[PDB]
Each structure stands twice: as structure tokens, then as C-alpha cells.
Amino acid sequence: TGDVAIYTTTSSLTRDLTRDAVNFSPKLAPTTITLNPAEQYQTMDGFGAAITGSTCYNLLLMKPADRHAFLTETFSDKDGFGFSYIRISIGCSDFSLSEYTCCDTKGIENFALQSEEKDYILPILKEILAINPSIKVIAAPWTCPKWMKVKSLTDRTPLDSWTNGQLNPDYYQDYATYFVKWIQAFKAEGIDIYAVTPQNEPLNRGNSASLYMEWEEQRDFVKTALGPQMKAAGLSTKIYAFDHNYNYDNIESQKNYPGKIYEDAAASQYLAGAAYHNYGGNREELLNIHQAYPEKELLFTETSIGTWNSGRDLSKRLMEDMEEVALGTINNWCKGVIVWNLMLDNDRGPNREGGCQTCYGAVDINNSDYKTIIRNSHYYIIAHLSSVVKPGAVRIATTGYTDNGITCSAFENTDGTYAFVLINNNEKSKKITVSDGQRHFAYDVPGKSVTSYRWAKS
Questions:
Q1: Nearest to 365 by CA among 71, 84, 77, 127
Q2: CA 162, CA 164: separation in Å to the nearest integer?
Q3: Where are the alpha helices (DSSP H) in 189-313?
Q4: Is the peptide bond before 350 cis (omega within 30 degrees of 0)?
Q5: Among 379, 284, 367, which residue's Cα sits nearest to residue 337?
Q6: Contacts of 320 (CB under 8 A, 6+ apart)
Q7: From CA 391, how far away is CA 453, in angstroms rounded?
Q8: CB of 4 closer than 8 Å to CB of 453
Q9: Enclosing H/E stretch for 131
Q10: Rounded distance between C-alpha atoms, residue 38 and residue 48, angstroms
Q11: Most exposed among 186, 262, 280, 395, judged by the fewest C-beta atoms under 10 Å?
């Protein structure tokens, strides 16, 4: 205990979200980072991970108390790290236990939540809500029902495929109804959907489930059906555009995907902003979009670790992920950060043919005991945000000490606490002083570390 609460993680695991504390120093010093609460940037919604079918199946195979302890650690603000934003699929994802939608039988009248929601998703989200009742939930479809597809806008004949195709414009109003019924069926279970996107990775035709949707199609779906139908149903649910990569998969016509939709006033009126993933391109794109459309929101919604980037090796992952995913997106105006599967087993699953089969969880659980859990970089990068940066916090400017290896972000929470998150990507420890303009503290910041700080303003 003391004036300043600290969480520390080192890439060597000499520290592992280890708790510490210091008190304010009275009365002048070198290597000082100063918070300027007067210069305010975006307001923060939250941070967390995806609650997929696989994640739920793995949680549900644990002993109840063990499951509840893990969810508490993860999601409780007062007794854990306070993960504050989750992402789920509308119908299946590539980490569902099958390919399905909530209207597989032709006709929108047939709409219903399926066994995956009833048996896996809903019971897990209810336990999460019991722990953290204000958690934000964003959702997206991986595919529309198969009968709503055509092969292409050129060839408007049915495509009976979980992957590829485009949305038949004749079904835009019925697909919008699908979203409304889905949001409403979740609300009847006690779950508020905070936001949606129209389609996960709309420029991807592969995966185990997908639907190709160019910006012109998403513009039209939103302005003519999804926007108006959600508003008429009285939904506060926000809509984010895009939900794909920074480089737009190098498809010339689709560059500035969300910006092109914003320039249609009728579509733009329904759009909070844009969601991004980081599987291609450069995060500078976030600053480019923010500068072009500064009244539109940015959200970071998906990234992965796996066999392609030594995802289990924290000595290779922690620094880079905290830089690029966590503080790199937030310092480029993202209002939250959400990684992919919260939990997969040590066999990278369960998973789907055509989907990712080389992915690791934010944590991995051992499928011999459903007890032993190892945290991977994603769990740390999120917990380092969510433990100290609470919903409604405002990101604020910092000035003073920097060098190569030092990255930081500072915030002011609505409760009158400041929060500071600091990467020291240098082999050596650094005695850093942190000042809020009125009081200051100092701390021996370990090498190759992430440290998170929280303290009361005077």
C-alpha cells in the first residue's frame, strides 16, 4: 500500500503483474515525465479480449470455482485486472464449435439464438456480468445466413457457402432485421450490446466463415437498412465501420474504406467510427484517419499471437505487443483495445477447418487438467491497461524524459485518479520521476518491463 499503486511485468517473468507501491516525494529531479491534464485527447471505453465459443468451452470444462477465480482475476475491477470490453460473434466465428448463423433456415421469421449461444456464450457472459456488470460488448458477424448471399454483385445467383460471396442487396432490410432481433434477444438475456460492426474482416473471402463486403456495399447496407432499423427499434448500440486491416489488404478501390463511407452524409450519420485489426499495414493509418475525420471514433478490435510469431515466448512478445497493440493504438487515438480469444487450450483449440489453427490464447489452459493456465503477452498488455485505465478515462499529454525504448500513455479517470502506463524497452533499470503538475513520485523501473501506475489527484 501507499499513495501510488503499481503493477509490473518483465519480459523475463521476474515480475508477473506483480503489485507494488510508492508514496509521493516531497519537493526537483532529473528523468521526469510530466502529465498535462489540460491537454486532453480521446475518452477511453475499455480493453479486453474475445469470448468465443472455444474460450467458453474451455472455461466450462474447468471446475466451477477455478473458472470463477479466473474470471474474477480477469474481469473484476476491485478484485482483479478489470478487463472492460469484450468482443463476440453474431452467429459463428472461426472459434465457434460449428459453422452456423441465427437464421440458417430461409426466411427472417425463423430467427433464433442457437445452441452455441444458449449453452456456451450466454452462461459465460452472465458470469462475467455478475463480476463486472458495466462491461462493454462489441459484436460482429463472420457471415450472413447462406441464403442471403450471391456469388458476386456481377452474378446475382445464390451461393450456398459459409465463406465468400457478397450480401444480396434484396436482403439488406432482412439482414438489418437479423441484427435487431439478435441485439434484442441478447437484451432479453440481460446483456447490453454496446456496439456492432457490419461484418468481421469484410475484405477477407477465406476463413471458416466470411462474407466479402466492399465499402460501397457497407455504405448502402448501413444507410438504407442497418442504421435506420436500429434507430427505429430504439437501440443505443453504436455502429463501427470496416473491422479490418490498416492497409485495406492492398486493394486499391478499398483504400480509405471507412473514410469513403464517412463522406456519404446519409451513411455517416449512423457511424460512430471505424474498427481496425493489425494483421497488415502500419498503425500510422490510425493517425491518418483520425486527422481526416476527427469527430469519428477509432477502436482497436482484433489481433492474434500464434506459431508465426513465437506467441508463447514472452521475451519476444511482451515489449513489441505492448508497443504496437496497446500503447501504439491508444497513442494513435483508439478508444479501446481488444485482442482475440481470451483462452484456448494447449492444442490451440478448439478450432475450425479453414480457420486459424496456429493461434494461441491470451491465456492457454492445459487440456489434461483444465486447471493450469499460462498467461501470454496479450493477457499482460490488456491487464496493464485495464487495471489502471477505467472506462470514461481521458488520455492526456505528457512531456519531458524520453529516449529510445521509452513509450508511455497517461490518463485521468472520472473518479479523480491519474493513470500512467510505461514501457521500458531497455535492458537497464531507470529511476523515473512522474509528476502530475502538483505532486510527484519516483520509481526504479525495471528493464524490459511494463509498469502501470494509479494515484489520486490532490
A1: 71
A2: 7
A3: 215-221, 227-232, 257-262, 265-268, 284-292
A4: yes
A5: 379
A6: none
A7: 16
A8: yes
A9: helix 122-131
A10: 28
A11: 280
Which residues does 331 contact at the CB level (< 8 Å), separation at least 6?
A: 407, 409
Give the closest residue to 124 by CA, choosing from 341, 366, 355: 341
- State the Cα–Cα distance between residues 316 and 124, nearest whole angstrom: 32
Output the CA–CA distances (angstroms, integers) from residue 447 to 14, 409, 430, in the order listed.
10, 18, 7
Q: Give CA–CA dist 244/242, Å, rounded.
A: 6
The residue whose grid cell reads 450480401 is 167
The amino acid at 302? E
Distance CA 46, CA 385 (A): 9
Q: Are 339 and 287 in contact (CB under 8 A)?
A: no
Q: How far apart are CA 102 and CA 35, in angstroms?
A: 48
Q: Which residue has the cell 452472465?
A: 126
Spatial contact of 362 and 356, defined as CB atoms under 8 Å apart? no
C-alpha span between 154 and 365 (Å, rounded): 46
Please enumerate in sequence order all residues whose Cβ is within 8 A of that of 181, keeping only pairs 6 or more positions apart, or say none: 102, 108, 111
Contact 338, 301 (CB under 8 A): yes
Asked if 53 contacts 120 with a C-beta cutoff of 8 angstroms, the reply is yes
In 158-246, at which residue ranges do the beta strands (DSSP E only) sit? 166-167, 195-196, 238-245
R_g (Cα) of the chain, nearest Å: 22
* Cα distance between residue 79 and residue 370, in whole Å: 22
Looking at residue 110, what DSSP letter applies? G
Q: Are 21 and 442 in contact (CB under 8 A)?
A: no
Domain ranges of the chain: 1-41+394-458, 42-393
Q: What are phi and psi of 44, to 5 degrees?
A: -100, 130
Q: Are 454 and 421 in contact (CB under 8 A)?
A: no
